[PDB]
């Protein structure tokens, strides 16, 4: 599954050969009218994910500080 | 400032040429005990952080139903 997050940006949600991964990453577009994934991507796991859903309250208070 | 989700993985938020970015991003461990960002990682304005925190509700159905 996928869903947006910007412009050429997106999380993506699949199983991957039995392993549930959150990758959230940058994309291009090739000469065939295709989205590719792009390098600027980090896959998590959804312990990982959990971690990240953790700390908003403190990623946020730092985005309205700094 | 800097938050864990994970071994070696870290979300930093910092103010770059006063532009905020939220990093989430794998780190090697360097010679001196140091954290240093890998390539692994993806730079995310306020508004796409915003976009991808809008966006939990539905990847977190998605992983549950993966």
Same mark, same amino acid.
């Given at each position: 599954?996928?869903?947006?997050?910007?412009? #050429?940006?997106?999380?993506?949600?699949?199983?991957?050969?039995? $392993?549930?991964?959150?990758?959230?990453? &940058?994309? /291009? #577009?090739?000469?065939?009218?295709?989205?590719?994934?792009?390098? $600027?991507?980090?896959?998590?796991?959804? &312990?990982? /994910?959990?971690?990240?859903?953790?700390?908003?309250?403190?990623?946020?208070?730092?985005?309205?500080?700094?």
């Amino acid at each position: 599954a996928m869903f947006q997050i910007g412009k #050429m940006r997106y999380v993506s949600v699949r199983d991957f050969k039995g $392993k549930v991964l959150i990758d959230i990453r &940058e994309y /291009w #577009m090739d000469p065939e009218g295709e989205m590719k994934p792009g390098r $600027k991507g980090i896959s998590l796991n959804p &312990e990982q /994910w959990s971690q990240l859903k953790e700390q908003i309250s403190d990623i946020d208070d730092a985005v309205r500080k700094l």
